Amino acid sequence: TLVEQILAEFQLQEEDLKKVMRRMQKEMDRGLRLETHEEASVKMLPTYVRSTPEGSEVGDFLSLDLGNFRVMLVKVGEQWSVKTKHQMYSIPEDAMTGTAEMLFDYISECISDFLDKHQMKHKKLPLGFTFSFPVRHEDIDKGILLNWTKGFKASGAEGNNVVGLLRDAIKRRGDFEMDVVAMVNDTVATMISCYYEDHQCEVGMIVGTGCNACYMEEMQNVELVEGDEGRMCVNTEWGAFGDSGELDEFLLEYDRLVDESSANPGQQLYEKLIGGKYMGELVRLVLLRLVDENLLFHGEASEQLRTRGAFETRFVSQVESDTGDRKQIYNILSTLGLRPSTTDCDIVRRACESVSTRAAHMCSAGLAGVINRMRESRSEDVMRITVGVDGSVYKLHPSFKERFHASVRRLTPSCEITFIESEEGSGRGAALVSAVACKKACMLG
Ligand SMILES: CCOP(=O)(Cn1ccc(NC(=O)c2cc(Oc3cnc(C(=O)N4CCC4)cn3)cc(OC(C)C)c2)n1)OCC
Numbered sequence: 066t067l068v069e070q071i072l073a074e075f076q077l078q079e080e081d082l083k084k085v086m087r088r089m090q091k092e093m094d095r096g097l098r099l100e101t102h103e104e105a106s107v108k109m110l111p112t113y114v115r116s117t118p119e120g121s122e123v124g125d126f127l128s129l130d131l132g133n134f135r136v137m138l139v140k141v142g143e144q145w146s147v148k149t150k151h152q153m154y155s156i157p158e159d160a161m162t163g164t165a166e167m168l169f170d171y172i173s174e175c176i177s178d179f180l181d182k183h184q185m186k187h188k189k190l191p192l193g194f195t196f197s198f199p200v201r202h203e204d205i206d207k208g209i210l211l212n213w214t215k216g217f218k219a220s221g222a223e224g225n226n227v228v229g230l231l232r233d234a235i236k237r238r239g240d241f242e243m244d245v246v247a248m249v250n251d252t253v254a255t256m257i258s259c260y261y262e263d264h265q266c267e268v269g270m271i272v273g274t275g276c277n278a279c280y281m282e283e284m285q286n287v288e289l290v291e292g293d294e295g296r297m298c299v300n301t302e303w304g305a306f307g308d309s310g311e312l313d314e315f316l317l318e319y320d321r322l323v324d325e326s327s328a329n330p331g332q333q334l335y336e337k338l339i340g341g342k343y344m345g346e347l348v349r350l351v352l353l354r355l356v357d358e359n360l361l362f363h364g365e366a367s368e369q370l371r372t373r374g375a376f377e378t379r380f381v382s383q384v385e386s387d388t389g390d391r392k393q394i395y396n397i398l399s400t401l402g403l404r405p406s407t408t409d410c411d412i413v414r415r416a417c418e419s420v421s422t423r424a425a426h427m428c429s430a431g432l433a434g435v436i437n438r439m440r441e442s443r444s445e446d447v448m449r450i451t452v453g454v455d456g457s458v459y460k461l462h463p464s465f466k467e468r469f470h471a472s473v474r475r476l477t478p479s480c481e482i483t484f485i486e487s488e489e490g491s492g493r494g495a496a497l498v499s500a501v502a503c504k505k506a507c508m509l510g
């Protein structure tokens with residue numbers, strides 16, 4: 066009963082989800098205004114991706130996705146045929162700890178490997194780059210890294226042109242040639258990839274290691290950009306929502322602990338409630354509190370349970386996947402150096418559920434804010450929209466998307482939302498934006 070009382074702190078009322086949604090809407094309006102942009106927690110970064118007429122260039126497009134690293138070859142043929150090939154690459158700590166130069170040298174090396182395994186190192190291809198970090202764009206192929214997120218810390222990157230860093234590393238290597246045609250956020254790439262299959266897709270969302278959304282905003286509303294005709298995609302960077310104290314009445318001890326011990330204290334607070342980088346850690350801290358209060362594992366925690374990041378977000382998914390026999394739960398805890406009881410297993414499950422349900426409900430508040438804002442901007446009484454979604458939390462968590470879809474739909478009564486689970490959106494969309502941008506780019510000279 067004391068266990069249940071502690072887990073009940075994660076609960077959120079429909080009245081406070083509505084408070085969060087309206088606060089997100091207020092923060093979104095702030096990010097778009099020239100007057101409040103520099104102070105605004107939700108940056109609402111213009112992407113330079115504009116509503117496009119039918120079709121794109123036909124051909125072979127290379128895609129890079131950083132934010133594991135992925136190289137993708139996308140074949141666009143002609144009605145339309147889109148075929149993909151991919152390779153995954155694990156980033157070594159050295160490439161993460163050092164310079165931006167070392168990071169882009171390892172990315173270049175991965176590109177060479179992909180080119181050799183696909184018998185194409187002699188081909189000079191157009192390249193789309195998904196770079197899943199806040200970027201101030203000057204165009205579709207030029208953007209400066211505002212700051213790292215999700216524990217990324219390579220020196221000499223912030224304030225520099227990310228496209229320039231990649232081009233330099235390709236030149237230093239001298240093993241292949243590529244035309245870097247576009248750089249997009251993963252939300253943007255996901256939206257573009259799902260748009261290919263559904264033209265009503267005007268929102269891209271990520272629920273992975275981090276959490277973010279982008280959407281098609283009226284050009285009239287984008288004050289940081291010249292023009293009043295059509296629409297442009299805006300990268301909300303909503304992970305930073307709560308950084309100017311917007312979420313203070315909702316933050317728990319476990320949230321402030323995760324934040325204090327993170328690579329970016331005081332930053333990405335909304336994200337820190339939802340993202341897979343943080344989810345497992347919130348659970349480990351809830352479990353440690355139960356152990357300290359002698360309510361779980363007879364007050365005896367292991368050296369492994371006491372280590373930061375030892376409770377992987379994958380364990381949270383696995384725990385909530387458990388059939389009922391508690392065998393999955395027992396095995397995770399046994400490997401973690403613990404000897405749990407059956408009751409201990411049930412406690413671990415309930416803690417996992419408390420953290421993930423809060424993540425889904427917090428996430429739905431943000432997405433509803435975006436959809437409700439668009440409905441107003443488009444003066445649509447009944448707005449029919451598609452949301453393209455990528456990320457391991459949304460895709461692989463046992464009940465996250467069910468809990469998330471219902472909560473979004475309760476906050477959006479006047480909307481008909483379709484959710485597309487994007488299989489390879491983050492990577493595929495970088496190539497498709499390149500294919501669309503290449504109608505103009507390949508003719509610049
Ligand atoms: C559009 C013109 O704007 P610009 O000023 C900036 N700019 C450069 C790119 C760019 N916009 C886009 O990439 C772009 C691409 C979109 O997704 C696709 C996917 N597939 C095909 C397709 O038909 N396919 C058949 C095979 C795939 C087409 N579009 C959707 C989109 O908006 C909607 C979400 C409203 C914008 N804007 O162009 C100059 C570079």
Ligand SMILES: OC[C@H]1O[C@H](O)[C@H](O)[C@@H](O)[C@@H]1O
Nearest residue numbers: 197198199214271275277304
């Ligand atoms: O990877 C999902 C998201 O993670 C973080 O929130 C990044 O700041 C954002 O740019 C990205 O879209």
